[PDB]
Design a protein around this ligand. Structure first.
Ligand SMILES: CCCCCCCCCCCCCCCCCC(=O)OC[C@H](COP(=O)([O-])OCC(O)COP(=O)([O-])OC[C@@H](COC(=O)CCCCCCCCCCCCCCCCC)OC(=O)CCCCCCCCCCCCCCCCC)OC(=O)CCCCCCCCCCCCCCCCC
Ligand SMILES: CCCCCCCCCCCCCCCCCC(=O)OC[C@H](COP(=O)([O-])OCC(O)COP(=O)([O-])OC[C@@H](COC(=O)CCCCCCCCCCCCCCCCC)OC(=O)CCCCCCCCCCCCCCCCC)OC(=O)CCCCCCCCCCCCCCCCC
Ligand SMILES: CCCCCCCCCCCCCCCCCC(=O)OC[C@H](COP(=O)([O-])OCC(O)COP(=O)([O-])OC[C@@H](COC(=O)CCCCCCCCCCCCCCCCC)OC(=O)CCCCCCCCCCCCCCCCC)OC(=O)CCCCCCCCCCCCCCCCC
Ligand SMILES: CCCCCCCCCCCCCCCCCC(=O)O[C@@H](COC(=O)CCCCCCCCCCCCCCC)COP(=O)(O)OCC[N+](C)(C)C
Ligand SMILES: CCCCCCCCCCCCCCCCCC(=O)O[C@@H](COC(=O)CCCCCCCCCCCCCCC)COP(=O)(O)OCC[N+](C)(C)C
Ligand SMILES: CCCCCCCCCCCCCCCCCC(=O)O[C@@H](COC(=O)CCCCCCCCCCCCCCC)COP(=O)(O)OC[C@H](O)CO
Ligand SMILES: CCCCCCCCCCCCCCCCCC(=O)O[C@@H](COC(=O)CCCCCCCCCCCCCCC)COP(=O)(O)OC[C@H](O)CO
Ligand SMILES: CCCCCCCCCCCCCCCCCCCC(=O)O[C@H](COC(=O)CCCCCCCCCCCCCC)COP(=O)(O)OCCN
Ligand SMILES: CCCCCCCCCCCCCCCCCCCC(=O)O[C@H](COC(=O)CCCCCCCCCCCCCC)COP(=O)(O)OCCN
Lengths: 443, 546, 228, 64, 108
């Protein structure tokens, strides 16, 4: 807590640096995100895996805002602290540095909060930052920014009275006493489903993602894909399943059909896309549908497998966004028809593209393979057909993945030259994390 | 010596694709690849003699545990038993000669060391596949050979048809990979483990054998999955030899022989229909490599029926796999030498005479062709006659039709293989390029596979060779007469006037054309519906003009 | 550089104390009823430090009162900065040798974002109205009047740049050559009678700077008679 | 156009209107695809029906 | 033939230089007008939606049809799981009061 105050105050000192010292501004904003990565690694060192489920607790009196660490929050916090310095390497202005610093404060505090009102306050305080990040004046899109902000606001406004309903019902929004009291679970369950089915892209409230994740800059796309979608999953695992479990059983056919149609229809839409960033953007919806069904199965080790799929997606899809961002930065287009023969002109970039293509399709020696196997073990244990639907549709994911790769990488060599040292080192931590988590993830 | 058969081709691939190869060049990388295969073959020979003959299986915990959540436990462990030793000997011995051939065949390619590294990776993932003791490390090998097959089929990436052939192989195998994954889920759920030695099934829930059979039909290119196999000729000749002999197509048959959890009706019907279909397909082709590809599909049908017959049939199935790899790789290497001697032409209407090839290439094609058609007291005679005689005494009435289909297939095979020899050498010359290849490395590559053909006659694959299943002389010597009938018909070069049957068979029954619109175009159109009518239409929320 | 960190902390604390003191003195003036602090007189400074970067002036160098030096400026022995001349080293430093003259209303500076430091050698004549941006000038060089020398250009020793010329970015001018033109180009070599006047030029400026420094001292004493 | 006399020119154009398939053809082929690629669902539904009709026979002839 | 670096490093912008500097926009694509038009049209394809016959029919049989198929399959899987676990009929949303949430202290 004292450490967190010191890290925030060190991060906020970027504004006071005079702008004529360019080197100092770059180094200060990069170190301001490097330090929380070290602190979260130390928190992993301090964790007792044979101890209590909630460790390193702190509660700030009668102000809500109570905090604690479990395994899902700790893995997601480690992933966020990895992803934020890479975002710092892709920005050039103090406005970008400050927006991403404020976003990192809000994400890190939202991932480990234990109060529902605290979760509401901390998460969607990032709405105006996302609006300004997506609708930036010369190269953004105001339509996309309006869509993402309005969908998130709609879901949050459905949740807010139900939050206050359980608060008047039992006397607290602390999740440890909300899980032990008697509450009207249908109303609160519908409010929580309303927020987290927009955060996780679940059809029909999913149309904001294709616009926002493409109109964003490369750093914004890395953040939005790798981090902000998983707040819906940790919302399911931390707040909704412990507090309204009767609802979570009774809504299972509806959540199940939403997940199945989201998976199938989003995979079918990904095949007709002609923009590389839109191809990468749609593929995330099917993965999150598998995550949601694995969470809702509650069957074998469902929290473990679903968290592991969230980590595998958060490693693999930001790297695909990084490669598309390199192509866009040095060729000024994201259109497939302008790219051919990238193997001959960018051999290192095409090799990285192929490896992350194989990772996104859940091939072995990548963490997505272990993730999808364990998620389908959790789904299979409820019924065999709910697993069969995901199993037989694997040709549809590989079709779009290999079609996009084969169209842009082979053929007549036209396009930009190979990657620089900076682009390679933006990609590199994700590759090392993927090789480790896909070969020896546990000990 | 045991881990040297698996690690060390992977090491050769890692060396030849990394920036170490920037310091070696083509000349140094060829040396590295050939040596890294010789060591692995020597290790596999030691493993073969220890496990097959002296009967001492070896289990190695290699890299600890892979992942273990709940009761789902996957470990990095190998086990070297009889089937594993058989497969390792076959794979490494074929891949050594294919590497020695490819270091001379692809000499004028600009990226030679990349090609050699891909060949070594493909071999190493095959070794990982057969050396695994549980299902998940097997899936590592399965998808590894799938990926390396994609990289090697579409090697000449500036050609669009090669790229589309590689994508087609990936997609057709991805359907069966999905079914195989669901079958692994069934097996683990209802037996509690993933290791092969704890998977003893007497009576399971039907979906197990069916889904594992579909997953095997994908890799072994059976009926309604054979469509990728013919288009995989876009890759270079060493790729085709290694795909059709030791890697990839033999993996599904190995999996079914290992598990033995099938239901025999599906297996017998699929195998016999595949054998007859690929026999009539290869009888009506003029592309020299496509005839050999269809003969591979036909022999995989024979092995499928055999493993349907029983445990003895499973042993005969493994035996035919082992003897098939040697003469199939020899056939592809000899065909590559004939193609290079004739200026790259692959049409058998533009061959003839004995000037475009070495004496050893013609001898290799002749001996491997005689082993394939079941000429007496050669290598394929023992295994093919064993499968045919086991099918003639099965008490299942379904196996009665299967045996008739196999005998018709045997006559067709002796027809088109004799046609392949006749068009290539016996007729008058009708090409215009005579550049015969007489380099040392491809000739030694062919001589090694001919030595393995002799070895299979001298030392059998299993104990079935020499066992007498008691059949009358009429039933026993009929396949010899069918071989002679194929030879006489093909040398007479006779044809029929029923041109609509000829063009129905030569166009390969229209499977690709019917698949181009029964699932494929509907998938594209349903994607159009889900995007345009759903995302942009029914679910879209507009703006409020003011 | 943590030394610069300590200097930064001390400079900011002293600046805050100075602001507080000047504000309290203005409150005292308002209490007295005297409003001389509101006069809009000229606040030009001949020497202008940039935080802790103070110009380093020799005791025998002279800067005219309408001239100015800012930031990291080094003036050598008997070197002169004349009337209206601006020598700016607040972004990147300026180094001037000995017996070199920066004549009336000339601009020497390194303020562009990618400019290196300015290095002016010994016995250098920088003419009237010449603009020097981030260049290096060797010994015994005349920079002609209203000339432009660009970033990373090298004016080697003994060369003459004619009046009104423009030497491009990163251009090396060799020794003993005369260059002229707006796309500046070699015109001829320096002649011997020309080189005599080139050798005798900077000493005159040294003695002229001495006379002007004495007259400016007279003016300062005249000014000091009023308030002292 | 330097190789048009060697490999052919660009005068002959592709005859295809890039139009969607007919509605009935799409519906029929999709129904066939659902029947072929989702056959475990129909197998298990048939199993449930054959099981519940036997319990109907037991409950009918038992209480008589 | 530009010179953007001094012999000791030190990048130069070349703002006033005659030779064209190599920079970030050197390999930007030359835009084909028809490709830009087609991508713009596909970017705004929601303006082309119309409730004609084919749109209504395909939105009924495929979108609503497969959504109803998936709901029926989900309910089938839920009921079969509850039967194969020893449970009675369980209360889904809109199904009258019944059993939800089995007790861990109970043997089923
Ligand atoms: C394999 C190759 C695929 C494509 C070739 C099609 C061959 C089909 C065929 O019937 O050809 C016979 C064909 C006779 O056709 P034809 O010579 O054009 O017609 C007969 C004459 O007009 C006149 O001849 P004829 O009247 O003197 O009698 C010849 C003919 C009977 O000819 C007739 O008059 C036809 C009447 C039908 C009943 C008798 O005799 C038979 O076919 C009796 C059975 C032996 O035989 C050949 O000359 C070709 C020989 C090549 C190998 C075929 C040997 C049989 C292979 C058995 C396996 C079948 C695989 C195909 C699966 C189908 C899909
Ligand atoms: C009160 C609504 C305010 C909140 C929404 C808002 O601000 O809408 C403004 C905005 C007004 O836009 P507009 O330029 O006047 O165009 C009106 C529609 O495009 C009208 O275009 P349309 O001819 O396609 O409308 C017929 C409409 C059929 O309309 C309905 O289904 C109305 C029934 C709604 C009652 C709830 C049950 O069918 C659909 O558009 C698809 C079925 C809707 C489900 O409304 C929309 O964007 C459409 C609203 C449709 C609601 C369902 C959204 C599906 C997700
Ligand atoms: C070491 C200390 C600062 C680090 C630094 O800049 O390194 C300099 C040094 C390079 O220095 P340089 O290249 O000459 O440029 C230095 C700045 O760019 C020159 O910047 P500047 O002097 O124009 O701006 C001041 C300077 C840092 O200078 C300071 O402000 C020193 C802090 C205390 C002095 C400020 C008091 C007067 C200001 C009034 C404002 C508040 C009113 C207070 C009155 C009521 C309170 C009772 O700001 C920074 O550069 C960093 C800003 C954040 C640092 C601390 C400010 C946070 C809030 C301060 C609260 C003040 C309340 C305390 C009472 O860098 C390094 O040594 C590398 C970093 C490793 C150390
Ligand atoms: C719900 C459980 C949490 C599992 C989430 C999945 C994690 C993804 C990766 C799997 C790694 C497994 C690690 C196992 C041993 C590590 C310690 C451990 O035990 O895990 C911790 C938590 O583990 C973690 O935090 C794992 C961190 C994984 C995140 C990795 C991604 C970030 C790295 C990015 C790439 C960096 C590359 C940099 C190099 C250039 C607690 O989990 P449980 O054992 O379930 O807790 C016990 C429960 N109880 C106390 C109640 C008895
Ligand atoms: C110790 C703390 C002292 C507090 C600071 C002093 C008071 C704040 C002054 C702010 C500055 C504004 C200003 O100009 O001051 C006013 C603020 O005025 C006041 O606050 C004065 C109030 C009366 C103070 C007490 C007088 C003596 C009482 C004891 C006997 C005086 O107005 P003038 O017009 O300048 O004064 C006229 C006088 N003279 C001709 C000399 C210029
Ligand atoms: C309004 C203010 C901004 C928004 C609210 C921010 C709230 C603070 C952040 C979350 C605080 C809890 C951190 C997680 C944790 O486990 O902390 C414990 C462990 O401490 C840590 O190691 C904290 C590490 C902090 C950084 C890790 C990420 C968390 C949030 C990051 C915020 C800053 C990020 C900066 C990014 C630029 C508590 O330590 P303690 O000694 O105070 O508690 C022990 C006991 O109960 C006594 O009270
Ligand atoms: C333990 C393993 C250590 C490494 C073993 C592998 C290295 C042997 C192969 C060396 C590279 C092969 C390429 C090569 O040497 O090419 C020549 C082929 O060399 C040969 O003669 C064949 C290679 C040696 C024999 C094969 C060795 C391979 C090992 C398997 C042996 C199995 C029996 C080309 O012809 P030449 O140089 O003889 O003639 C020159 C030409 O006419 C004028 O330009
Ligand atoms: C982009 C795709 C590229 C594909 C690459 C090829 C395909 C790879 C597929 C499988 C990858 C698995 C890699 C695992 C890495 C190490 C994991 C184990 C970590 C560890 O500490 O284990 C110990 C390490 O031992 C050891 O490692 C042995 C000790 C050193 C002796 C041998 C040295 C290795 C020589 C290998 C040559 C090249 C082979 C290439 C694969 C073994 O002990 P344990 O704790 O597990 O205990 C149990 C038995 N004691
Ligand atoms: C001229 C065309 C005739 C076609 C038949 C092939 C030649 C067989 C001659 C023959 O009549 O042999 C019979 C074989 O029939 C049988 O009993 C066997 C029928 C099936 C034989 C098909 C394969 C023939 C070998 C090639 C008698 O047989 P036998 O009394 O001489 O037999 C005991 C001595 N080994």
């Amino acid at each position: 807590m004292f450490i967190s105050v010191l890290l925030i105050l060190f991060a906020l000192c970027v504004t006071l640096i005079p702008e004529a010292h360019y080197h100092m501004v770059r180094v200060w904003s990069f170190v301001a995100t490097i330090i929380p990565m070290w602190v979260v690694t130390w928190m992993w060192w301090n964790f007792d895996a044979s101890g209590h489920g909630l460790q390193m607790l702190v509660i700030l009196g009668r102000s809500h805002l109570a905090f604690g660490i479990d395994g899902v929050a700790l893995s997601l916090m480690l992933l966020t602290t990895v992803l934020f310095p890479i975002c710092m390497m892709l920005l050039r202005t103090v406005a970008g540095f400050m927006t991403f610093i404020l976003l990192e404060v809000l994400v890190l505090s939202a991932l480990c909060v234990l109060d529902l009102l605290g979760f509401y306050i901390l998460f969607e305080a990032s709405l105006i930052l996302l609006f300004l990040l997506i609708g930036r004046a010369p190269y953004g899109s105001l339509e996309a920014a309006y869509k993402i902000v309005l969908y998130t606001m709609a879901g949050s406004l459905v949740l807010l009275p139900t939050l206050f309903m359980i608060y008047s019902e039992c006397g607290t929004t602390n999740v440890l006493y909300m899980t032990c009291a008697y509450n009207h679970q249908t109303v609160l369950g519908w409010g929580l489903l309303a927020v987290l089915a927009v955060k996780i892209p679940l059809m029909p409230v999913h149309l904001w993602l294709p616009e926002a994740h493409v109109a964003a800059p490369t750093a914004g796309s890395v953040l939005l894909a790798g981090v902000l979608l998983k707040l819906g999953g940790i919302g399911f695992l931390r707040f909704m399943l412990p507090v309204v479990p009767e609802f979570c059983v009774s809504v299972f056919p509806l959540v199940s059909t939403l997940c199945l149609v989201s998976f199938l229809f989003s995979t079918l839409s990904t095949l007709r896309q002609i923009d590389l960033k839109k191809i990468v953007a749609y593929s995330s919806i099917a993965h999150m549908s598998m995550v949601t069904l694995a969470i809702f199965s509650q069957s074998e080790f469902s929290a473990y497998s679903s968290s592991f799929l969230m980590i595998a997606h958060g490693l693999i899809s930001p790297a695909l966004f990084l490669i598309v961002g390199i192509l866009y930065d040095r060729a000024h287009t994201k259109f497939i028809l302008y790219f051919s023969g990238l193997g001959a002109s960018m051999p290192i970039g095409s090799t990285l593209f192929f490896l992350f293509t194989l990772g996104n399709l859940a091939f072995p020696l990548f963490p997505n393979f272990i993730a999808e196997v364990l998620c389908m073990v959790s789904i299979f244990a409820v019924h065999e057909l709910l697993a069969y639907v995901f199993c037989v549709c694997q040709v549809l994911g590989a079709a779009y993945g290999f079609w996009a790769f084969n169209r842009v990488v082979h053929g007549l060599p036209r396009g930009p030259a190979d990657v620089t040292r900076t682009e390679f080192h933006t990609v590199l931590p994700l590759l090392i994390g993927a090789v480790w988590l896909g070969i020896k993830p546990m000990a | 010596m045991f881990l040297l058969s698996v690690f060390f081709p992977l090491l050769g691939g890692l060396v030849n694709t990394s920036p170490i190869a920037r310091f070696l060049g083509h000349r140094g990388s060829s040396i590295i690849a050939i040596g890294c295969m010789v060591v692995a073959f020597i290790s596999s020979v030691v493993i073969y003699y220890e496990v097959v003959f002296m009967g001492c299986a070896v289990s190695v915990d290699v890299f600890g545990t892979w992942f273990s959540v709940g009761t789902f436990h996957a470990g990095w462990t190998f086990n070297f038993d009889l089937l594993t030793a058989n497969m390792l000997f076959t794979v490494t011995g074929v891949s050594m000669a294919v590497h020695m051939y490819a270091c001379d065949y692809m000499r004028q390619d600009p990226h030679l060391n990349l090609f050699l590294g891909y060949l070594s990776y493909f071999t190493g993932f095959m070794c990982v596949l057969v050396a695994a003791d549980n299902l998940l490390v097997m899936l590592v090998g399965w998808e590894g050979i799938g990926v390396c097959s994609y990289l090697l089929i579409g090697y000449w990436s500036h050609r669009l048809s090669a790229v589309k052939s590689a994508q087609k192989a990936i997609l057709v195998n991805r359907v069966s990979d999905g079914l195989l994954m669901w079958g692994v889920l069934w097996v683990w759920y209802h037996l509690g483990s993933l290791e092969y030695d704890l998977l003893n099934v007497y009576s399971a829930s039907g979906f197990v054998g069916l889904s594992i059979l579909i997953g095997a039909m994908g890799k072994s290119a059976q009926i309604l999955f054979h469509v990728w196999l013919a288009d995989a000729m876009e890759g270079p000749t060493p790729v085709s030899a290694l795909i059709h002999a030791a890697t990839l197509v033999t993996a599904g048959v190995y999996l079914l022989v290992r598990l033995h959890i099938h239901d025999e009706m599906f297996v017998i019907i699929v195998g016999s229909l595949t054998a007859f279909m690929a026999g009539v397909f290869g009888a009506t082709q003029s592309d020299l490599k496509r005839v050999i590809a269809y003969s591979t599909c036909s022999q995989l049908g024979y092995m499928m029926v055999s493993l349907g017959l029983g445990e003895t049939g499973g042993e005969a199935s493994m035996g035919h796999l082992m003897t098939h790899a040697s003469f199939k790789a020899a056939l592809f290497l000899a065909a590559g030498m004939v193609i290079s001697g004739n200026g790259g032409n692959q049409h058998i209407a533009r061959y003839g005479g004995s000037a475009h090839s070495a004496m050893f290439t013609m001898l290799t094609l002749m001996v491997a062709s005689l082993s394939l058609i079941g000429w007496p007291e050669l290598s394929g005679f023992y295994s093919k006659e064993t499968i045919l005689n086991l099918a003639a005494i099965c008490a299942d009435p379904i196996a009665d039709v299967a045996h008739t289909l196999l005998l018709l297939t045997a006559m067709l095979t002796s027809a088109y293989t004799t046609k392949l020899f006749y068009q290539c050498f016996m007729v008058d010359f009708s090409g215009s390029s005579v550049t015969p290849v007489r380099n040392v490395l491809p000739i030694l590559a062919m001589a090694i596979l001919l030595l393995d053909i002799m070895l299979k006659v001298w030392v059998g694959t299993n104990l079935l060779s020499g066992m007498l299943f008691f059949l009358p002389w009429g039933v026993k010597t009929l396949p010899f007469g069918l071989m002679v009938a194929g030879i006489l018909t093909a040398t007479a070069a006779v044809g029929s006037e029923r041109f609509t049957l000829i063009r129905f068979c030569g166009s390969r029954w229209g499977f690709d054309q019917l698949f181009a619109r029964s699932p494929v175009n509907p998938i594209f159109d349903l994607g159009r519906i889900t995007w345009a009518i759903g995302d942009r239409g029914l679910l879209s929320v507009g703006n409020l003009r003011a | 550089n943590p030394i610069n960190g300590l200097k930064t902390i001390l400079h900011r604390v002293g600046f805050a104390m100075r602001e507080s003191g000047q504000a309290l003195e203005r409150v005292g003036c308002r209490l007295q009823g005297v409003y001389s602090f509101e006069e809009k007189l000229n606040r030009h400074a001949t020497v202008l430090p940039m935080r802790h970067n103070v110009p380093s002036l020799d005791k025998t160098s002279w800067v005219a009162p309408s001239g100015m030096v800012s930031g990291s400026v080094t003036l050598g022995e008997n070197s002169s900065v004349w009337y209206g001349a601006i020598v700016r080293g607040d972004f990147q430093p300026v180094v001037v040798g000995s017996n070199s003259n920066i004549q009336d209303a000339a601009y020497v500076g390194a303020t562009s974002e990618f400019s290196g430091p300015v290095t002016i050698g010994d016995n250098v004549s920088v003419g009237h109205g010449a603009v020097l941006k981030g260049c290096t000038v060797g010994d015994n060089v005349l920079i002609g009047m209203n000339s432009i020398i660009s970033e990373h250009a090298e004016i080697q020793s003994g060369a003459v740049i004619a009046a009104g010329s423009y030497v491009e970015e990163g251009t090396t001018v060799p020794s003993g050559e005369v260059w002229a033109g707006s796309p500046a180009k070699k015109l001829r070599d320096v002649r011997a009678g020309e080189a005599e006047y080139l050798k005798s030029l900077p000493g005159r400026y040294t003695e002229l700077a001495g006379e002007h420094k004495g007259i400016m001292k007279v003016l300062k004493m005249k000014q000091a008679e009023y308030f002292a | 156009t330097s190789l048009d006399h060697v490999f052919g020119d660009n005068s002959n154009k592709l005859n295809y209107n890039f139009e969607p398939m007919g509605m009935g053809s799409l519906f029929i082929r999709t129904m066939v695809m659902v029947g072929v690629f989702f056959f475990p669902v129909f197998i298990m539904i048939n199993d449930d029906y054959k099981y519940t009709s036997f319990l109907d026979k037991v409950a009918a002839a038992k209480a008589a | 033939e530009a010179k953007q670096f001094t012999p000791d490093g030190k990048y130069m912008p070349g703002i006033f230089s005659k030779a064209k500097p190599l920079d970030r926009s050197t390999q930007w694509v030359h835009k084909n007008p028809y490709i830009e038009a087609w991508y713009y049209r596909r970017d705004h394809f929601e303006n082309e939606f119309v409730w004609n016959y084919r749109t209504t029919i395909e939105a009924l049989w495929f979108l609503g049809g497969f959504t109803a198929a998936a709901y029926a399959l989900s309910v089938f899987a839920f009921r079969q799981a509850d039967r194969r676990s020893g449970y009675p009929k369980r209360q889904i949303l809109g199904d009258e009061p019944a059993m939800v949430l089995p007790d861990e202290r109970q043997f089923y």
